[PDB]
Structure 1
Amino acid sequence: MGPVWRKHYITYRINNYTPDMNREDVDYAIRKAFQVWSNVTPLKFSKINTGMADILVVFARGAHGDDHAFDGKGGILAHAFGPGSGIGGDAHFDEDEFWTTHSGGTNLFLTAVHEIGHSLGLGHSSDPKAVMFPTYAYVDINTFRLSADDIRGIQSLYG
């Protein structure tokens, strides 16, 4: 029962890009991650390059300006703030990980689906098949599906 955006049009902006991947692949991973959630809700997401976005996607290292400092390679991979103005909604990814499009390193798409879930108001799930489960696991991203638990959670917040 976390906070929700009180609107169905939500903007995002990619503040900066990890050097681990090329720019087009970061854009693609993030766009696809948003699409996962838009597919089961009334929410629409538009990327903007200037202006005031609701959800700011950031790659940062260690102590990076909030009360959720990162811990170097491994451990916590990313974190996100629930809906709200300013820092609210923003999704932060630990640059000390090695972000990838694949099964090696840490898959950006999967991690982004999880974080965007928080950006929309979801908390963690106890279901090990849920993308909102607390621990990262790689799954073939081409056959990725939200679990029924994730769909339940997000539909309880929107629509």
Structure 2
Amino acid sequence: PVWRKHYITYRINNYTPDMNREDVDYAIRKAFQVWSNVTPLKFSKINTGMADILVVFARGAHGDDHAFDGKGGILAHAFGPGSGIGGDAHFDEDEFWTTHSGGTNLFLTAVHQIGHSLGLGHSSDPKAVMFPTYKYVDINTFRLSADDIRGIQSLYG
């Protein structure tokens, strides 16, 4: 299933102490842009009320029956499109979130995760952002794969 709307709201539930807030805000917003640039979807940040996509930073057990696992291992996960917890993107706060390198990069992780929030599954092209394994790539040249674009457009046009 997909979202039945073109306007989709997200909300940052809380912030990681690893990065400054402006940078977290920029990486979430830019990561939505990636999907927004190749779809009819529009993504708007709300600061109050109930959003479609709740962005959470949390460690270990955090009340959705998919406890994180400490530093490394599971980096994030997000639920597919739906009511309540559907759409919500979670990031493991035991990781060290970074603007660029030398941690787990938030933008790239969030692009991938937003991808699952939107309904995508995994790709077999290593160049695809929806490829199963995290790996830092040059953000200056970051670009969606044809696999990613065919997929997202298969869902939303």
User: What TM-score does the superposition give when structure 2 sets the normalisation length?
Assistant: 0.99
RMSD in angstroms over aligned alpha carbons?
0.6
The reply on whether 1:140 has 2:144 as its aligned counterpart is no
Shift in Å at residue 4 of structure 1? 0.2
Task: Tell me the secondary structure at the aligned position of residue 92 of structure 1.
Answer: strand
Shift in Å at residue 68 of structure 1? 1.3
1:39-91 deviation per Cα after TM superposition (whole angstroms, max 9, x unaligned): 00000000000011000000000111012110000001000000000000000
User: What TM-score does the superposition give when structure 1 sets the normalisation length?
Assistant: 0.97
Shift in Å at residue 140 of structure 1? 1.0
Structure 1: any 5+ residue segments left out of the alignment?
Answer: none
Task: Tell me the secondary structure at the aligned position of residue 141 of structure 1.
Answer: coil
Shift in Å at residue 107 of structure 1? 0.3
Structure 2 CA distance, aligned partners of 1:146 and 1:138? Answer: 14
Structure 1 CA distance, aligned partners of 2:91 and 2:116? Answer: 13
Structure 2 CA distance, aligned partners of 1:77 and 1:128? Answer: 18
1:98-145 deviation per Cα after TM superposition (whole angstroms, max 9, x unaligned): 000011110000000000000000011111111101100101112100
Aligned length: 157
Structure 2 CA distance, aligned partners of 1:25 and 1:16? Answer: 14
Moved over 3 A (4+): none
Structure 2 CA distance, aligned partners of 1:95 and 1:16? Answer: 11
Task: Tell me the secondary structure at the aligned position of residue 49 of structure 1.
Answer: coil
